[PDB]
């Protein structure tokens, strides 16, 4: 029953330590002028974040290579079986189904 005793112990030191740092001098009596001088060294910066694509694909591109290496995960439990040939013949398919899915897209990464 002692796991949650070992988790909420950990946060409660951390969720404590924000206030004893952030908050404690935050109410101190120093000046702290409201002037809009903050947001350093790009003073104003008025724009939307524009869509920039080769930022985007490197999200998608991963998400799919991700899946099957969940599918690929239960090899070391499956190395203990009865008929094993249906493993080696089958196990090696996923991989090559992964590696193929590279080679195609590999004609165009662009600047990744």
């Amino acid at each position: 029953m002692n796991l949650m005793l070992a988790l909420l112990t950990n946060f409660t030191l951390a969720t404590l330590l924000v206030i004893i740092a952030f908050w404690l001098p935050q109410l101190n009596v120093y000046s702290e002028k409201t002037s809009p001088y903050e947001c350093g060294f790009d003073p104003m910066g008025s724009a939307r974040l524009p869509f920039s694509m080769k930022f985007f694909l490197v999200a998608i591109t991963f998400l799919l290579f991700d899946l099957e290496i969940a599918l690929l995960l239960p090899l070391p439990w499956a190395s203990q079986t009865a008929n094993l040939n249906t493993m080696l013949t089958m196990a090696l398919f996923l991989i090559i189904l992964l590696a193929v899915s590279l080679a195609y897209e590999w004609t165009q990464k662009g600047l990744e």
Binding site: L24, P25, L27, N28, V29, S31, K33, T34, S35, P36
Partner: protein, 319 residues
Amino acid sequence: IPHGKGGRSSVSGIVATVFGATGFLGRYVVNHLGRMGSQVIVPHRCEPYDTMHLRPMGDLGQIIFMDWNGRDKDSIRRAVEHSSVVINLVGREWETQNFDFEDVFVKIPQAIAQVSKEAGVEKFIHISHLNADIKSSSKYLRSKAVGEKEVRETFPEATIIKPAEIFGREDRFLNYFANIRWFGGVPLISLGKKTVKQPVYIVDVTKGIINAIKDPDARGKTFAFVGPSRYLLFDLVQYVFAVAHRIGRLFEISPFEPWTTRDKVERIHTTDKILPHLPGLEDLGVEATPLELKAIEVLRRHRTYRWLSSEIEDVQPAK
């Protein structure tokens, strides 16, 4: 004797002294003597480093610092001995856990109304407040109108000053509001009746002094400081949330510098507009400044961009 032009690194013949001159007001006067030329001897109490933000004020060899306590009758006698005019802004809000506050408007302004009178200052000056009346109010607001009586005895020439509730940049008057993110705005006392006072903008007061600083011909003759038009409404407390869109402290934090459940809540609603017959301002002018236009600047909050503010006030009445 005045030389040249008033830019900086000039003379203009007046020395001065300004006691206090650390917190909101005094910092903002000396900055007008670090321009037209002077010799501004600013003493200060306890603060070694809180006085630095001041120093790029006079050119070079103009302002000069000393150290003093003020209950020692010598500390005020060592400086002033060479001076022309000496004004006095000293005094503060809440009773200190050390200074019992009773005579710090009585003994202190006299303690510096000691040898100053003797030693040959001239055009000595002191501060009053538009709302202080010797009838019974208000525990802090009282003892201030004693100085108008008790202290005026000494130095027959004063030109002691009587301004209103003032709104500066870093000031604590109009800033007690909008710090009120809290269980809710509760006016004083939950009534929209007698707000508001004459909210003059801090420039005009600090341009009054230096306009009387060599006036000439105002000594003994006290003045009071007009506000803008005209009286004001409850909307002033709504106006705060209309646009806002809803020294020597410590290392960590202090123990008590509160909202003072005491005179503070009742000092703001005491109103009492008072005698017009005081000259008191355009004569010392020429200055008067509004509110609606100058209250965006000092108020900047978490939008920091949008304003689009069309809403105004009549006066309001009793006007």
